[PDB]
Amino acid sequence: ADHKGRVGHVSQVIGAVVDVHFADGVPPVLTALDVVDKLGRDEPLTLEIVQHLDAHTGRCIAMQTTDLLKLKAKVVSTGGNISVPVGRETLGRIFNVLGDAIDQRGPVGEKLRMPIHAVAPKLADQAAEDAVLTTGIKVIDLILPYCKGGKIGLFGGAGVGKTVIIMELINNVAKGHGGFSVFAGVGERTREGTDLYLEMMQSKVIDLKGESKCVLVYGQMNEPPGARARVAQSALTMAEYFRDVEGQDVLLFIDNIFRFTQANSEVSALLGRIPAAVGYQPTLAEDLGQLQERITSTTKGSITSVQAVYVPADDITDPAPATTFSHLDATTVLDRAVAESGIYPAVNPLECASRIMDPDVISVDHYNVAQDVVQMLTKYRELQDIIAVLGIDELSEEDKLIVDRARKLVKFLSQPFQVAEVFTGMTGHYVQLDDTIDSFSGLLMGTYDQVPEMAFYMVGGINSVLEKAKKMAEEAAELEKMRRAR
Amino acid sequence: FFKTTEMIGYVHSIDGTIATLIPAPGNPGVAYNTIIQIQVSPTTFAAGLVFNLEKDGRIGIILMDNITEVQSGQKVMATGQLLHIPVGAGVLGKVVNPLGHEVPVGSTLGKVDTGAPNIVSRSPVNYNLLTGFKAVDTMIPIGRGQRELIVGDRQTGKTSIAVSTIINQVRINQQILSKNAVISIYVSIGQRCSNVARIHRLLQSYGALRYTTVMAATAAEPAGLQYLAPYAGVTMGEYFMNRGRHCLCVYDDLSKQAVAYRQISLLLRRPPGREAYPGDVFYLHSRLLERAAMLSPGKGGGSVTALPIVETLSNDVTAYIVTNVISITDGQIYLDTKLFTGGQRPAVNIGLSVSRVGSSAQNAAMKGVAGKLKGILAEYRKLAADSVGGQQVQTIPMIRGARFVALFNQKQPSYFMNAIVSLYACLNGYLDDVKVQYVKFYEYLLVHRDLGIMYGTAKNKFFYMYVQELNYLIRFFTLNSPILHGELEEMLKQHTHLFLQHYQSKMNAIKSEKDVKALKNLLYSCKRAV
Amino acid sequence: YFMNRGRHCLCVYDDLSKQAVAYRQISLLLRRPPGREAYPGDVFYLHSRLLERAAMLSPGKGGGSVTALPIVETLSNDVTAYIVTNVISITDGQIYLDTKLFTGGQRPAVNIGLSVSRVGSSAQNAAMKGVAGKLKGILAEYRKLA
Amino acid sequence: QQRTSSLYNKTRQFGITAALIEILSAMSSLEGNAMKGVRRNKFWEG
Ligand SMILES: Nc1ncnc2c1ncn2[C@@H]1O[C@H](COP(=O)(O)OP(=O)(O)OP(=O)(O)O)[C@@H](O)[C@H]1O
Ligand SMILES: [Mg+2]
């Protein structure tokens, strides 16, 4: 506060690293500085203090290109860390690291701003007990339930409808829990960011003329590493506002978390720090910790993060994924093979995992049903391979009732999303947690052993299954009646 | 002639192509990443680029030309301006240095360091860009504004694909309006001057220089030039993008650029990273490829299509540079050595090749054919997995997969009508009775000949393969349309019947020592004729 | 404090693996010669001066004790890691928790085949020693039979 | 295949680390051999 408007002069410029000399003393670390001299630059220049070289000289990382920058150029402190707008006015808008609207849709008109860097919640602010996050999706809420204050790794690239799942989660969380969402594109292709924005506007999650339920914060590849290493924190700060001020269950999507690690690695290299194993920065654990720890469920609200993970060289022991996986409370595997099987959401139930799959957290009935489903699916795999050498006619009648129930389960874990009510034409479903548990529990026992297999395909709940079966029966009867006439 | 403004200092040290300057009296300042002129001779200057601004006043300089004339103690002047190169329709058909100087062979100014379009200024990729190859246009679509990598090992056919793509646009730009014409910019980096000349002759033979420009930073040119060539190349291409036109930039190749940037950084004492590359290498490539985009209709609808080329040593895609480029581009075309030596040319490994854009970058006719073509080939590979012994059984999916994998063998790019028709014929089973060895000959007769007219049996009124102007009708109306579907099937049926009756019948009856050789030569010629 | 006074204590370090990373971070920021896996040369001494303070004091000093249960994280069941081996070279025994058993529903997933206690045999209670004497042979035969 | 893949992914990690360590050792050697000379500035003018 006492360093608001303090004046300094540029002393050194080496790539994206700039050293500034202040006669009155360097401001605190992580302070933001603005280069007043915009002589020939097409964009404003802002620097972030990262180190102190002496009592008067300070090293900083430029968030934009340092072209047309001369020594002794004037610089003015902003009075604190980078400030980002927070409030309900940021919904449906696109921002950058500096919290400037890049959608060319008029002024934001915020009422408050918050610093990018904020300490994580103290041990006394943690939630009393773990709670489940009902996403409205049968598979996620049964075999790998999400958790409030949890970080969930969405393994699996594109071509598997990853964006559709993200949009559905954004819609369902607001629909059920009344919590907003913040999407952070770290080192993301500019083309894909445009496509995501158009899809969101098409699905009405971002209603220009109405009320939106999602914020976007994009730090693209073409931006220097100083920006890609702070965009996530800016988005996290926006979510923190809703978590604390409004007390909500917010969502924070990160695409990807690896790009965040890579950006900090590049920044550390520029400063000249000695890299650790596999060329990563020595502060790899600390950089992730200062971010993930801020993502937790407090006494006011919660922030559940869905982070898209990328494994370099398909090596799961690499320090980046290895350090990341230690912070993840759930895994969602998206596979093309399942999508090519016509199962959307394309989720491999046996490849996913979750830590709250314990009776001490979820209801005992939920845990028993989930384990029974997993066991049945695992048995269905071995039986599938047995019939390859034998033929289904050989299998025992226990193993031919278990190969019939399993197929119904696989078809029943698919679901039509409301986000695709337009481009697919089928009304979406939002299956409640209790409804899913009861439906699967009944199916496992064998109550629905007469319903046709296809009645479970792309349906929500058990009532939908009955309605589809009746329609199928009516259609079959009409066709048979017409055939008898001719 | 870069315009010098003031003296900023004197040369102090020289380390090959890297120099340092000490400040002049009064310690005048120089803008970062700007151009300077070193007075090598009384009336001659050497170009240099500012790279470092040390605290003590020393300046790091990357030399660009006339390095042999640079000596310590010489005078340095500054231009105070970024690098701007000539651009416009007046540069097409010429060899140009990254500094804008023309290279002798035997309109406005553009900044070489400019930002990419923002999110709101872009549009989805829908317009296709035809490479002229059936494999690429079908399994790995490329759309205008897309960034498609070409990754492969040495001597696998990387440069050929890009050159053919540039050439394939000549026959199209001549017909349609210049608005939709595709202007090509081929950037040679760290190559030989001989290869540039041969490429220049090759383009001139097909008349592509009228729509193409070549930017060369060859070996024996200082690393500084090799590091700026791609940026200058896009700057030439961005001129057309900001004016509602389409451009195609090819980089051959980014592997050598990264080495040059590494050389510059290390000689200037910058913190090295993995494989000794600096920490800005990823940023270097990203800000280069991200400048290739597809502008929205509100900004003219122009585009820049990027085709970076990368050399993978020993089929290792785990290298630092390769991974970074792959993580930036929108897909990749993988050229495999074994297929290249196996007679499959182009050697695209469709299993490892991908296009994240997808069918959106395909025409209606191509999209319909590809929808079924992709499915068939997968079954052929899976059944081919059991073809290692066991006497693979020829089901219809295999009977058609083999023909598809034999039609993909070509030397020169194929006109859209010829390619789409041939794929459609193989898709509907017209080649089931044609042996795999004679497919190329069958295609050649279909394209360059007309059996129906030869035997006086053709009944179609307009649909003939010699009518090269049907291509745009096919593009507007898919082959699966009543306007063209009826005549198309009639011609294919008639051509197939005549071929089996007359030609293949004689081929199966060849029994001699010279006829067999003549047949073998004919098949090989047809293999590289279409 | 309790050992010096004749009382007993139990310390659980969760975990020494993350301490090494922090010490490596400090060393590299100081620009010190990296060693194997970029860890500093004195990373072994970091844990040596720690675990050696865990001891059973002789009767003359009071009979105090500080039992220590350091924890270590491996990758893909790799016990050949630099840090893992260093700690194994300091402790008096190891409890190995195989991932396969844990995922198979067999919890706590103690892989008795790899685990060992080098000095704890004597301290074992007389009653449990009687039961465990034959149990060792039974399990040994059971593993061989399957 | 699961045992030779681990040794291949463990080898690439070690190879990257060692090569980088070598380069930094040379960088530190050339920095250490360098010595700062007498500062020729107007020390009194301060
Ligand atoms: N489709 C093709 N069919 C037949 N021959 C081809 C084809 N494409 C390229 N070739 C031939 O293969 C050889 C290598 O081609 P090219 O010059 O494109 O290789 P490259 O990928 O640029 O390799 P490098 O630049 O490292 O030498 C040349 O003899 C060229 O004529
Ligand atoms: Mg080449």
Side-chain angles (χ1 to χ4, degrees):
Chain A
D2 60 329
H3 60 82
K4 208 303 186 179
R6 186 177 300 182
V7 179
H9 301 290
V10 180
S11 178
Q12 187 171 220
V13 181
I14 300 176
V17 180
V18 184
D19 307 6
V20 183
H21 181 268
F22 298 86
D24 303 356
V26 303
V29 184
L30 300 178
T31 302
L33 315 174
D34 301 0
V35 182
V36 178
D37 303 332
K38 195 185 179 181
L39 306 179
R41 292 182 56 82
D42 205 332
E43 303 176 355
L45 176 52
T46 179
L47 309 175
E48 188 183 15
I49 303 181
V50 179
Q51 302 188 0
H52 294 184
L53 308 183
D54 59 60
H56 300 281
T57 311
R59 186 162 292 180
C60 320
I61 293 287
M63 298 295 180
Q64 301 82 341
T65 183
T66 61
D67 297 0
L68 301 176
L69 187 61
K70 294 179 181 181
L71 295 180
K72 303 178 291 187
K74 183 177 180 181
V75 177
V76 177
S77 180
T78 59
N81 301 11
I82 292 180
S83 58
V84 69
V86 298
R88 306 180 66 86
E89 320 304 344
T90 61
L91 296 173
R93 304 293 296 274
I94 307 182
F95 296 90
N96 58 9
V97 179
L98 312 180
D100 298 330
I102 63 182
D103 52 55
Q104 301 176 0
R105 199 170 299 283
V108 181
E110 74 290 358
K111 300 180 178 182
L112 183 59
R113 287 204 167 194
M114 287 293 184
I116 299 298
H117 307 269
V119 299
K122 310 302 181 182
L123 176 58
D125 308 359
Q126 300 297 343
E129 297 182 357
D130 297 359
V132 179
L133 180 67
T134 59
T135 61
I137 299 167
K138 285 175 287 186
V139 197
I140 286 171
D141 287 0
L142 188 81
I143 294 173
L144 54 151
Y146 290 4
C147 39
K148 301 185 185 186
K151 290 144 275 192
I152 300 93
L154 186 58
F155 298 83
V160 303
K162 186 175 71 62
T163 181
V164 180
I165 300 176
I166 290 170
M167 301 161 73
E168 176 61 16
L169 288 172
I170 293 168
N171 179 90
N172 290 338
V173 61
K175 179 179 178 177
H177 302 274
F180 302 107
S181 299
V182 185
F183 189 93
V186 193
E188 190 64 4
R189 303 179 181 80
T190 312
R191 181 184 61 84
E192 293 182 345
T194 298
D195 301 1
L196 184 63
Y197 183 57
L198 299 180
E199 289 184 354
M200 285 188 172
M201 286 193 303
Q202 187 176 26
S203 61
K204 302 181 179 180
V205 302
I206 296 174
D207 191 328
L208 305 173
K209 306 301 299 187
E211 296 291 357
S212 300
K213 56 178 69 60
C214 183
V215 183
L216 300 185
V217 191
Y218 283 134
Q220 309 297 6
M221 295 181 177
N222 58 337
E223 297 188 9
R228 307 198 298 273
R230 303 294 183 265
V231 65
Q233 303 182 18
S234 309
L236 181 60
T237 299
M238 293 181 178
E240 284 185 1
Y241 174 92
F242 296 148
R243 182 194 64 188
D244 303 332
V245 178
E246 299 184 7
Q248 301 179 357
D249 298 0
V250 192
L251 284 185
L252 180 63
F253 300 86
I254 303 182
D255 182 2
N256 298 319
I257 190 64
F258 173 87
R259 296 283 190 275
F260 172 87
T261 295
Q262 180 180 25
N264 289 269
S265 172
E266 296 172 9
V267 171
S268 180
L270 298 180
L271 305 174
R273 299 180 175 176
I274 293 174
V278 194
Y280 289 111
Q281 65 277 29
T283 66
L284 177 54
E286 184 172 356
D287 293 326
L288 291 171
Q290 290 179 354
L291 182 71
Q292 305 288 20
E293 295 298 339
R294 292 170 64 184
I295 294 172
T296 182
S297 58
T298 64
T299 59
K300 302 180 179 180
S302 171
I303 292 172
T304 304
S305 181
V306 181
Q307 307 174 349
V309 183
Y310 173 91
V311 179
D314 297 351
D315 191 2
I316 198 172
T317 62
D318 183 297
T323 306
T324 303
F325 295 8
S326 53
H327 286 260
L328 301 186
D329 300 356
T331 289
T332 297
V333 171
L334 310 185
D335 288 328
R336 308 193 155 192
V338 183
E340 293 171 15
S341 300
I343 291 300
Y344 297 81
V347 179
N348 189 335
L350 302 180
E351 197 68 6
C352 297
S354 181
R355 68 170 190 81
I356 60 179
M357 181 56 62
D358 184 307
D360 303 1
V361 185
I362 59 174
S363 61
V364 183
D365 186 4
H366 186 302
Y367 178 80
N368 292 326
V369 171
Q371 297 302 141
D372 297 359
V373 171
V374 172
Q375 180 179 357
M376 183 167 294
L377 295 170
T378 303
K379 231 296 183 177
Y380 176 62
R381 178 178 180 176
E382 292 180 351
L383 290 182
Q384 273 192 152
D385 308 6
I386 280 169
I387 73 159
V389 177
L390 276 73
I392 61 170
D393 304 303
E394 316 311 330
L395 276 185
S396 312
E397 292 180 353
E398 290 183 356
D399 303 15
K400 289 172 75 184
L401 292 172
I402 294 159
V403 156
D404 280 321
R405 293 177 180 180
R407 292 176 173 176
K408 296 179 181 181
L409 285 170
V410 171
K411 301 269 144 292
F412 194 21
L413 287 170
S414 57
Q415 178 178 315
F417 293 163
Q418 159 168 354
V419 176
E421 264 177 3
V422 179
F423 181 70
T424 278
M426 295 181 179
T427 313
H429 284 278
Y430 175 89
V431 190
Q432 297 293 355
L433 178 58
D434 58 68
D435 181 8
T436 303
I437 301 167
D438 303 4
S439 306
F440 278 87
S441 181
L443 176 54
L444 290 175
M445 291 185 295
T447 63
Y448 316 98
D449 289 336
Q450 302 176 355
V451 186
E453 180 182 357
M454 299 300 299
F456 301 87
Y457 182 82
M458 297 298 299
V459 300
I462 190 63
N463 302 19
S464 303
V465 175
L466 304 176
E467 295 294 350
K468 187 173 184 178
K470 293 179 179 181
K471 293 183 177 183
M472 292 171 58
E474 292 179 5
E475 173 60 306
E478 294 175 0
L479 294 175
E480 294 177 0
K481 186 176 183 179
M482 292 175 62
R483 285 186 175 185
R484 293 179 176 181
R486 301 174 181 177
Chain B
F1 181 95
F2 307 99
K3 281 197 170 174
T4 63
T5 65
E6 81 179 350
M7 181 192 59
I8 53 163
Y10 298 86
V11 180
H12 183 56
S13 183
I14 302 179
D15 188 333
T17 58
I18 297 299
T20 61
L21 315 184
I22 50 171
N27 189 268
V30 65
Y32 182 83
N33 193 25
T34 53
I35 296 290
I36 61 101
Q37 299 296 323
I38 308 172
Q39 192 155 26
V40 292
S41 315
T43 187
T44 303
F45 297 85
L49 186 67
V50 180
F51 207 67
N52 293 346
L53 300 176
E54 300 179 14
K55 179 177 179 181
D56 53 331
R58 296 186 176 190
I59 306 165
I61 302 300
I62 304 160
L63 308 177
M64 301 293 182
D65 61 334
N66 308 22
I67 295 186
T68 58
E69 304 177 3
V70 186
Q71 310 178 7
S72 187
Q74 291 183 356
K75 187 182 181 185
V76 179
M77 309 290 291
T79 63
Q81 297 180 351
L82 304 176
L83 176 58
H84 299 57
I85 57 175
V87 183
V91 181
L92 303 174
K94 304 176 186 177
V95 184
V96 179
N97 216 31
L99 297 174
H101 304 295
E102 296 183 1
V103 183
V105 185
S107 301
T108 58
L109 298 182
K111 276 190 175 186
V112 183
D113 273 317
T114 301
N118 54 334
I119 305 183
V120 175
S121 300
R122 294 164 175 265
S123 163
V125 179
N126 58 83
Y127 203 169
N128 73 331
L129 184 153
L130 296 174
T131 58
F133 297 91
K134 286 160 282 184
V136 181
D137 295 0
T138 58
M139 308 300 298
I140 308 99
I142 305 180
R144 305 189 179 186
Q146 185 175 350
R147 307 160 294 172
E148 191 65 15
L149 181 68
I150 303 183
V151 53
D153 204 356
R154 60 187 168 83
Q155 307 296 353
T156 50
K158 306 190 297 299
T159 297
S160 301
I161 283 182
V163 168
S164 293
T165 299
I166 290 173
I167 291 170
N168 181 23
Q169 308 300 333
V170 178
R171 185 171 178 177
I172 305 172
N173 301 17
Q174 291 172 339
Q175 300 174 347
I176 67 182
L177 305 175
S178 302
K179 160 181 173 56
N180 300 327
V182 179
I183 276 60
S184 300
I185 305 178
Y186 178 84
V187 184
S188 180
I189 310 176
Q191 302 301 340
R192 294 185 294 163
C193 303
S194 305
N195 289 332
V196 175
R198 296 184 187 94
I199 292 174
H200 183 275
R201 298 183 185 92
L202 180 59
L203 294 174
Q204 188 173 6
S205 179
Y206 299 88
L209 291 179
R210 190 183 306 279
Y211 313 98
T212 302
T213 166
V214 181
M215 175 166 290
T218 63
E221 302 293 352
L225 295 175
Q226 310 187 19
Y227 146 78
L228 294 174
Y231 292 92
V234 299
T235 304
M236 289 181 173
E238 283 187 339
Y239 169 92
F240 303 105
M241 187 181 63
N242 297 282
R243 292 175 171 73
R245 302 192 65 178
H246 307 264
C247 180
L248 173 65
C249 293
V250 178
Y251 320 112
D252 189 325
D253 45 2
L254 299 185
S255 299
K256 297 179 173 61
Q257 182 199 10
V259 178
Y261 189 65
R262 176 174 65 179
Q263 168 174 337
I264 295 168
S265 301
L266 295 177
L267 294 176
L268 286 172
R269 299 297 186 85
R270 287 197 172 181
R274 183 181 169 187
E275 291 179 8
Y277 291 100
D280 308 81
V281 66
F282 179 93
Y283 175 61
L284 178 79
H285 282 167
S286 57
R287 72 173 194 262
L288 166 62
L289 300 169
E290 292 288 347
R291 293 174 67 178
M294 170 57 174
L295 298 182
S296 61
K299 293 199 176 185
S303 71
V304 176
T305 310
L307 296 178
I309 298 174
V310 175
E311 182 183 358
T312 45
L313 305 187
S314 287
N315 295 338
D316 282 329
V317 307
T318 55
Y320 192 18
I321 301 300
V322 182
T323 300
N324 296 12
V325 178
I326 289 173
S327 61
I328 295 166
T329 60
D330 314 333
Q332 62 172 19
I333 291 169
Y334 197 99
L335 301 185
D336 184 57
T337 294
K338 291 183 179 179
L339 294 167
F340 178 84
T341 60
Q344 256 282 328
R345 303 177 195 181
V348 178
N349 191 258
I350 296 162
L352 299 177
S353 306
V354 59
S355 182
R356 299 176 62 87
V357 173
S359 297
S360 300
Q362 279 183 329
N363 186 267
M366 181 60 68
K367 183 182 298 187
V369 177
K372 307 176 181 181
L373 173 53
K374 296 178 179 181
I376 288 172
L377 289 170
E379 303 180 25
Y380 176 51
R381 300 317 199 184
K382 297 163 188 173
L383 295 176
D386 298 333
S387 62
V388 178
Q391 193 67 358
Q392 39 164 333
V393 168
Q394 328 308 337
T395 62
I396 294 174
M398 298 187 63
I399 287 285
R400 296 178 177 182
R403 276 61 170 184
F404 282 134
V405 178
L407 292 171
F408 292 166
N409 304 9
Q410 52 184 133
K411 216 298 182 186
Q412 301 298 342
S414 299
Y415 194 72
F416 182 81
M417 184 179 63
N418 306 332
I420 188 68
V421 170
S422 56
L423 297 174
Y424 179 86
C426 175
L427 178 56
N428 297 28
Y430 291 87
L431 285 65
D432 298 359
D433 297 358
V434 184
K435 297 175 68 178
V436 182
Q437 296 75 2
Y438 306 150
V439 180
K440 304 304 301 184
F441 185 69
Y442 173 90
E443 188 177 1
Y444 179 85
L445 294 177
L446 174 56
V447 174
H448 298 278
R449 299 292 186 176
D450 189 329
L451 304 181
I453 298 171
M454 182 184 299
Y455 299 99
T457 306
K459 301 178 180 181
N460 300 276
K461 297 181 67 177
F462 59 88
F463 201 105
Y464 295 86
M465 293 299 300
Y466 75 91
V467 182
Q468 297 297 347
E469 300 186 359
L470 287 179
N471 169 26
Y472 300 84
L473 290 160
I474 294 170
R475 289 175 64 80
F476 192 94
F477 301 103
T478 63
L479 302 181
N480 296 275
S481 173
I483 289 72
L484 308 173
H485 182 248
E487 294 194 355
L488 170 59
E489 287 186 343
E490 177 59 18
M491 186 184 65
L492 296 173
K493 179 178 180 180
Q494 187 175 136
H495 180 272
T496 301
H497 171 68
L498 297 175
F499 177 85
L500 300 172
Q501 177 177 353
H502 298 278
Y503 294 99
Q504 189 179 242
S505 303
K506 299 174 183 180
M507 290 183 176
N508 299 327
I510 298 294
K511 293 183 176 181
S512 179
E513 188 175 0
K514 61 183 180 298
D515 299 358
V516 176
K517 182 172 185 178
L519 183 64
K520 179 174 68 60
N521 301 20
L522 177 60
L523 295 177
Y524 292 165
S525 300
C526 290
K527 181 183 173 185
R528 51 181 155 88
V530 291
Chain C
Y1 171 97
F2 292 108
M3 160 169 84
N4 302 321
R5 278 152 196 72
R7 303 192 57 185
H8 302 263
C9 174
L10 173 67
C11 308
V12 180
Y13 314 120
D14 183 60
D15 48 356
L16 301 190
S17 288
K18 296 185 181 65
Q19 183 196 17
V21 177
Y23 189 60
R24 179 178 70 180
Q25 167 179 339
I26 291 171
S27 305
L28 296 179
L29 291 178
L30 299 175
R31 308 191 65 83
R32 290 181 173 182
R36 187 182 294 269
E37 298 181 17
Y39 284 98
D42 60 333
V43 66
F44 170 84
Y45 182 57
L46 179 73
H47 295 160
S48 285
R49 64 182 173 187
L50 172 62
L51 302 175
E52 290 287 320
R53 299 174 66 174
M56 172 69 198
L57 296 190
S58 62
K61 284 188 169 296
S65 180
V66 172
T67 316
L69 303 172
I71 300 172
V72 170
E73 175 174 341
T74 67
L75 303 175
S76 299
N77 285 344
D78 190 3
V79 309
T80 68
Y82 181 50
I83 301 302
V84 178
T85 48
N86 293 340
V87 184
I88 291 172
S89 176
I90 300 163
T91 61
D92 311 358
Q94 61 185 38
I95 301 172
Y96 187 93
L97 306 186
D98 194 358
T99 305
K100 299 186 177 182
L101 301 181
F102 185 91
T103 56
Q106 209 295 332
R107 299 176 182 178
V110 181
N111 185 325
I112 298 170
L114 304 177
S115 306
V116 63
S117 183
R118 307 184 187 182
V119 69
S121 57
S122 62
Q124 197 171 26
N125 175 248
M128 192 82 73
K129 187 177 298 194
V131 182
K134 305 184 176 183
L135 177 59
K136 174 176 181 179
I138 295 295
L139 295 174
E141 297 182 7
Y142 181 70
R143 299 182 191 93
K144 298 178 185 173
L145 298 177
Chain D
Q1 283 174 220
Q2 288 195 298
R3 187 230 291 158
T4 61
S5 68
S6 296
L7 300 161
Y8 164 86
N9 275 331
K10 217 176 160 178
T11 295
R12 69 162 269 280
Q13 291 183 13
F14 296 156
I16 301 161
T17 315
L20 180 59
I21 286 163
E22 162 196 356
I23 297 156
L24 302 168
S25 301
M27 194 179 61
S28 294
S29 174
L30 296 163
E31 289 176 3
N33 305 352
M35 296 298 298
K36 85 210 97 178
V38 168
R39 305 193 298 254
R40 301 283 284 283
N41 76 89
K42 296 182 176 58
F43 51 89
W44 64 89
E45 183 178 358

